[PDB]
Design a binder for this molecule. Sequence first.
Ligand code: FAD
Ligand code: FAD
Ligand code: FAD
Ligand code: FAD
Ligand code: DUR
Ligand code: DUR
Ligand code: DUR
Ligand code: DUR
Lengths: 210, 218, 213, 210
Amino acid sequence: MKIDILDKGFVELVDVMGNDLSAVRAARVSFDEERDRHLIEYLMKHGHETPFEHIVFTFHVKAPIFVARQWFRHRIASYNELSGRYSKLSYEFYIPSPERLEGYKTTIPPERVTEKISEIVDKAYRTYLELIESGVPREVARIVLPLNLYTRFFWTVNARSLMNFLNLRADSHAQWEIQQYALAIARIFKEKCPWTFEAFLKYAYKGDIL
Amino acid sequence: HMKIDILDKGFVELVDVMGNDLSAVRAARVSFDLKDEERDRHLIEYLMKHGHETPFEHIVFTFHVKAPIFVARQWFRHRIASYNELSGRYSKLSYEFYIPSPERLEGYKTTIPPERVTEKISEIVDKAYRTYLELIESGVPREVARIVLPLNLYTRFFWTVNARSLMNFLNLRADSHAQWEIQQYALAIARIFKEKCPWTFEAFLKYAYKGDILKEVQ
Amino acid sequence: MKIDILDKGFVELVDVMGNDLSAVRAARVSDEERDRHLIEYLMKHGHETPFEHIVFTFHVKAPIFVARQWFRHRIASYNELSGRYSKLSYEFYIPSPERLEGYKTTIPPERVTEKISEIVDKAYRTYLELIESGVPREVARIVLPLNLYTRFFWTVNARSLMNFLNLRADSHAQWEIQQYALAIARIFKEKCPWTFEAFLKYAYKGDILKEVQ
Amino acid sequence: HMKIDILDKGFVELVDVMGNDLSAVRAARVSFEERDRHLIEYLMKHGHETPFEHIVFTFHVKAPIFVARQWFRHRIASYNELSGRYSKLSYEFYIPSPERLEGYKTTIPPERVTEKISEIVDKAYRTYLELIESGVPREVARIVLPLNLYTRFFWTVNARSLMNFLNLRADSHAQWEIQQYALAIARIFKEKCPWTFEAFLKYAYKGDIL
Ligand SMILES: Cc1cc2nc3c(=O)[nH]c(=O)nc-3n(C[C@H](O)[C@H](O)[C@H](O)COP(=O)(O)OP(=O)(O)OC[C@H]3O[C@@H](n4cnc5c(N)ncnc54)[C@H](O)[C@@H]3O)c2cc1C
Ligand SMILES: Cc1cc2nc3c(=O)[nH]c(=O)nc-3n(C[C@H](O)[C@H](O)[C@H](O)COP(=O)(O)OP(=O)(O)OC[C@H]3O[C@@H](n4cnc5c(N)ncnc54)[C@H](O)[C@@H]3O)c2cc1C
Ligand SMILES: Cc1cc2nc3c(=O)[nH]c(=O)nc-3n(C[C@H](O)[C@H](O)[C@H](O)COP(=O)(O)OP(=O)(O)OC[C@H]3O[C@@H](n4cnc5c(N)ncnc54)[C@H](O)[C@@H]3O)c2cc1C
Ligand SMILES: Cc1cc2nc3c(=O)[nH]c(=O)nc-3n(C[C@H](O)[C@H](O)[C@H](O)COP(=O)(O)OP(=O)(O)OC[C@H]3O[C@@H](n4cnc5c(N)ncnc54)[C@H](O)[C@@H]3O)c2cc1C
Ligand SMILES: O=c1ccn([C@H]2C[C@H](O)[C@@H](CO)O2)c(=O)[nH]1
Ligand SMILES: O=c1ccn([C@H]2C[C@H](O)[C@@H](CO)O2)c(=O)[nH]1
Ligand SMILES: O=c1ccn([C@H]2C[C@H](O)[C@@H](CO)O2)c(=O)[nH]1
Ligand SMILES: O=c1ccn([C@H]2C[C@H](O)[C@@H](CO)O2)c(=O)[nH]1
């Protein structure tokens, strides 16, 4: 499973441990359908969330730095990211579409905002290459690159923490760009843990957009 | 399926595992993609030797453990993990108790024979258990009645833990300063870890393991 | 501040970093009415991270079965007496007869209390005999019952503390830990009155603290 | 209260502290000079680190985003940062000094690298103001700003986690810029917990520069 997001981003599922029944087993402390599904709803409605910690996902995410900064505020998870100091990058940048501004009364056309963003990114990138060419190390030269530069990371997260992430980020108060990522995370979650996901939406989900 | 017996009635059972040694390699490189055994194994050693531990967080285990409460209290001090335990207030229990073997005391100068210590422990547990049943029979709820049961009562739990936190657990508990009973559990955890992540385990022993027992035992 | 709990337990405040204004400063990243209004605003909209910048240290004396529940709260720091090495006072929680009032028992509540006292005395005497004969503490203590009192230090931030109160200052929690949670709430209220009142009004999910002053 | 200036416009300021060296001693003994100092050394040399969690600091930090991204990887701590979406910013940028490049054979003089960095940040900043003036919301407009933009945050952290931070960041493998911040954090730590700090350097500190 891989879902494209924004202009060059994506969320890709790398691995998953367990499924809905992993939470049921943990709740019953028992290794060895209607009753199991009823238990999942029960746990969710009463806030008995610890059993959901025994379901774990690993994702591979490509996102602009400003999105990644918000995402990385979720401390109850594991992250490994490309190195700005040492890694080869593709040097791609998130350029908002004109539709992103639709809704706001701007004194220049949305298409022109897009163009100005693209221009300043190109200038920053060209300054960066000149610095590199003249022998400035990457860890210094890259500081002139803008916040819409794409990075990549691995994210390992359990279903309880993932639900918190969806509560906060799959919500209209979150920035639109990370909402888009959160929708994709939700889709993958739903595919792998349909009972947990449905119970979550029904009883515990605090956001609006799902 | 891996299940190892511990103490007189305890066990550690593997329930599930996400990933393997290559999960750490992929996370370190940030590449979901190009396998090369010698370079991959070299990267695991490199990470371990230089203390780059975050890639090991992407390997995760779930165990099912049966252990006496005094062991579980030590275990549950490891906060970077997930636990679900039987309820003392509401769950059915089997009411089994850890009775140390006479060999457990061999090593200490005692004024009574080790066999007699074992017997006295068995006796007081039986008395406690019988008092407990009398309380239950007379209508005292379990959450109150169970407080007279001793600390060697067995409980069960699920434990989900990543390999980084697992290595911390082994550093601290697979060690002669840890209580002998929890050492026995830690050796079983190590055996399972070794079986599932042999490269990580070997690199851990070689570069990062701070304890004493796992360099001797196998 | 030290509050007695159960028959021999307590909660004592050791230290506190900050006060209500610590959360205000952290939220603003740098007039009492506007500051109090901000605390209510944060609490009402679920902006909880600023409350992480208020921290408490408590010293708690509680029976092991209560401590086991308490220590499930992972987002906190604990240091407890060593069962293997520490000197203990060997005291035990004996429920009062009133603790059983509410349950139809076939023996009088006073008799339940007595039977508990008896079995703890027997366990404790067996323990002393084991110790006297040279059995090390780390082994001998395993015969002691779960109502043995222990002590610990607990360092915890106000956000995690509010989670603790949501779960433990609540009628679904065991009565014994409810009593501890009420004392924690009293101390919290004394040190962070605005946070506490906003918590009760907008975020508290339990039942007992809306009833009990 | 203590404030140390870092880089060209950054700082680390101590906001508050709970406890001191004796807080760790009290927690280790569970009880409310030579023997106390000896206990701190003992704990440190044997890796008995949990008592140090009962010492807690709050800092106020002003640092460039690229430094903040490294810092915020330390999950065992609490953070509150200025909002890129909603907060007023001062719009200041870290411009490396010519001495920062000394050590590297560059084909342009270090002073010219500094100038080029200043230029591209000015251009990015001016593009940003134009976008703002034309009604583009801040959460979109700010994505063109470079990674050397200064941000501010509150950081609450216990001494155990602070020692892990110093092991990793007060070290020559860490980027030079965050080394400077780590040195200031270490200064403050030393001032408030001298026995802990000395024991840490003696027995546990894994880095080189302290
Ligand atoms: C719409 C929106 C606007 C935002 N604006 C800002 C802003 O302007 N500035 C800013 O700095 N941040 C901002 N954030 C980030 C926000 O403050 C949180 O950092 C982020 O939402 C992660 O939430 P969390 O702490 O619940 O998640 P995690 O860090 O994954 O924590 C998960 C859960 O564990 C608990 N937890 C984890 N660590 C601790 C701890 N140390 N103490 C107590 N409990 C803990 C809490 O229960 C938490 O819910 C914003 C977030 C959103 C959604
Ligand atoms: C031989 C031995 C004797 C012991 N004796 C006692 C005793 O007498 N009394 C007692 O109370 N305990 C005792 N313990 C328990 C010990 O203090 C730790 O609670 C236990 O070893 C868990 O270790 P941890 O904190 O490293 O693991 P975890 O809690 O799993 O944490 C793992 C890592 O995450 C970090 N971490 C997690 N949470 C925090 C935080 N809040 N702040 C900073 N860093 C954090 C640390 O880097 C830590 O190493 C003993 C342990 C051993 C092995
Ligand atoms: C009435 C009652 C009955 C109970 N019965 C049982 C029982 O039968 N068996 C049993 O085992 N336990 C039982 N518990 C304990 C319960 O399962 C929790 O362990 C305990 O309430 C601590 O809650 P917490 O996880 O929110 O707290 P903390 O562990 O302090 O965590 C605080 C917050 O941080 C986040 N967090 C911390 N660590 C993680 C993680 N690893 N993954 C995801 N999120 C995390 C969550 O947002 C959490 O709310 C019971 C608790 C109560 C109150
Ligand atoms: C020189 C240098 C280069 C780096 N390069 C990169 C890079 O290229 N890419 C990249 O992504 N990162 C990089 N990092 C960041 C690094 O991987 C860590 O994210 C960062 O150093 C924080 O370390 P920490 O995990 O020990 O701290 P914290 O996250 O504060 O954790 C403190 C301690 O708690 C424990 N802990 C906390 N959470 C968990 C958990 N979920 N599981 C297990 N244990 C836990 C560990 O014991 C840990 O030491 C680099 C760091 C340095 C110093
Ligand atoms: O919607 C938001 C706004 C801000 N931040 C955090 C991320 C970063 O640390 C800082 C940026 O202002 O605050 C978020 O996580 N989400
Ligand atoms: O020295 C470094 C290099 C990288 N990173 C992390 C921070 C950020 O998330 C990403 C930048 O490459 O990796 C660090 O924390 N420290
Ligand atoms: O009300 C309860 C019941 C159980 N537990 C946890 C504590 C211990 O780990 C185990 C005992 O059943 O479950 C609690 O935390 N609170
Ligand atoms: O070897 C030990 C000794 C003590 N403790 C912790 C467990 C419990 O909370 C308390 C009991 O002494 O201290 C351990 O974890 N390991």
